Amino acid sequence: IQRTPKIQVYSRHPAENGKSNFLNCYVSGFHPSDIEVDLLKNGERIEKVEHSDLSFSKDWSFYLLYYTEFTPTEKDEYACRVNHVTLSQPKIVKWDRDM
Amino acid sequence: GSHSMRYFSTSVSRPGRGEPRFIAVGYVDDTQFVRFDSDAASQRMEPRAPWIEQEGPEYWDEETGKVKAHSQTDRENLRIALRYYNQSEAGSHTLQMMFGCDVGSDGRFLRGYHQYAYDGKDYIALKEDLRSWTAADMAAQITKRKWEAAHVAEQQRAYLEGTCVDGLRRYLENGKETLQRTDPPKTHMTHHPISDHEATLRCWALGFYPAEITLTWQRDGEDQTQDTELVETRPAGDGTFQKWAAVVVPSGEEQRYTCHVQHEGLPKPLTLRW
Amino acid sequence: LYKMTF
């Protein structure tokens, strides 16, 4: 009846500085469906971010992909911020180039 | 191989904020192809895959008709559920539905589905015989008696053995180039010391379709089940999928470890070794 | 192709 989101933040291709790419936040296994997911660039919310249509797995738990086009650089840090009823404060997960 | 079609639907009631939000999506195998959102400006079923655009507006007129009907039914089901569970109109509640079919590689019917969940738990489901219902609680027993007396199962069986299977075969043919494709995983290894005496080996699979895949780590041929960190398979966003699996090894015993990758797009399983 | 109450 209540399930916390699993969270993965990652890029569509292995990151290369100066080469355009997509930043993804994938949230899954959660219930209920109301959730807020934001992508952050150096702490600041990226404005143009899209997401897949609400769907769910065999066990009825929801999943969504949030994504945005981006061009990684050596200095820029990225993160995903997830806001859900099961979370007393939003969970912030950092982008690691090798995860 | 085998194939499947699934329509998923969610209704979420929002008491003070007007009438329930309804979102439906349709899939062939791991590929989304249609969507409908009750809060969207369009009020139509929309395409989400290239191969479904070629359908004429009669398909679309009929599909948005059927899907709009479904949202109204599920809106009333949410109210009936409030009564059956004696719940207040204050709360938000969720009704999910899935239906669809599987076919074999010859395109023959294997399985039909038609099931509901309320607030994230099983409510009522049609059994594999496509004749009987599984009621998950007392509230669902009422619905079961109601649907048994009304012969709802026979209608669904007709849809699932007929229309649903024909649709699947059609989409599988029209979209043969993307749906019947197999993209094998692009693999590689990363390697990072985590101290003077230990290191992480991580095995990657990228750009594969369909999503089904197995990554396994062995040490001298011995499976490292309990000591393998594994992430859930995730969409890359371009229609393909990704996964990795990692182990912590003593340096430099890296050569004792093998990562094994199995996927339907590979002629033979891959073995990677640092 | 898409497809009584509780």
- Look up residue B5 and give its two tokens: 């079609």
Query: Domain limits at A97?
Result: 1-99
What contacts B233, CB < 8 A, 6 or more positions away? B211, B213, B241, B242, B243
B52 by Cβ neighbours in 10 Å (0-12 / 13-18 / 19+) ranks as: buried
How far apart (Å, rounded) are the C-alpha atoms in residues A3 and A35? 12
Residues from C in contact with B at Cβ < 8 Å: 1-6
CATH 3.30.500.10 spans which residues of chain B? Answer: 1-181
- A70 contact B CB<8A: no
Q: Do the chains contact at B232 and A6, CB–CB below 8 Å? A: yes
Contact A81, A90 (CB under 8 A): yes
- A81 contact B CB<8A: no
CATH 2.60.40.10 spans which residues of chain B? Answer: 182-274
- Look up residue B140 and give its two tokens: 């669902």
Handedness of CA B206, A54, A89, A69 (dihedral sign): positive
Contacts of A52 in chain B (CB under 8 A): 32, 235
Structural domains of chain A, count: 1
3-class secondary-structure state, position A89? coil
In this structure, which CATH number among 3.90.230.10, 3.30.200.20, 3.40.50.2300, 3.30.500.10 belongs to the domain B1-181? 3.30.500.10
Q: How many CB pairs under 8 A join A and B?
A: 72
Contacts of A55 in chain B (CB under 8 A): 8, 25, 27, 32
CA distance B116 to chain A (A): 9
How far apart (Å, rounded) are the C-alpha atoms in residues B199 and B250? 6
How far apart (Å, rounded) are the C-alpha atoms in residues B210 and B239? 9
CB nearest A98 (choices: B35, B190, B234): B190
Instruction: Give the residue carrying structure tokens 């249509």.
Output: A53
SS (H, E, C) chain B: CCEEEEEEEEEECCHHHCCCEEEEEEEECCEEEEEEECCCCCCCCEECCHHHCCCCHHHHHHHHHHHHHHHHHHHHHHHHHHHHCCCCCCCCCEEEEEEEEEECCCCCEEEEEEEEEECCEEEEEECCCCCCEEECCHHHHHHHHHHHHCCHHHHHHHHHHCHHHHHHHHHHHHCHHHHCCCECCEEEEEEEECCCCEEEEEEEEEEEECCCCEEEEEECCEECHHHCEECCCEECCCCCEEEEEEEEEECCCHHHEEEEEECCCCCCCEEECC
CATH number at residue A82: 2.60.40.10
Topology given in CATH for the domain delimited by B182-274: Immunoglobulin-like (2.60.40)
Q: Do the chains contact at A99 and B236, CB–CB below 8 Å? A: no
Resolution value in angstroms = 2.3
Alpha carbons within 13 A on the beta-carbon side of B255: 1
How far apart (Å, rounded) are the C-alpha atoms in residues B202 and B274? 10
B8, B10, B62: which is closest to B33 by C-alpha? B8
With vertex at residue B176, the alpha carbon angle to CA B236 and CA A22, rounded to the nearest 5 degrees, is 15
B94, B100, B101: which is closest to B123 by C-alpha? B94
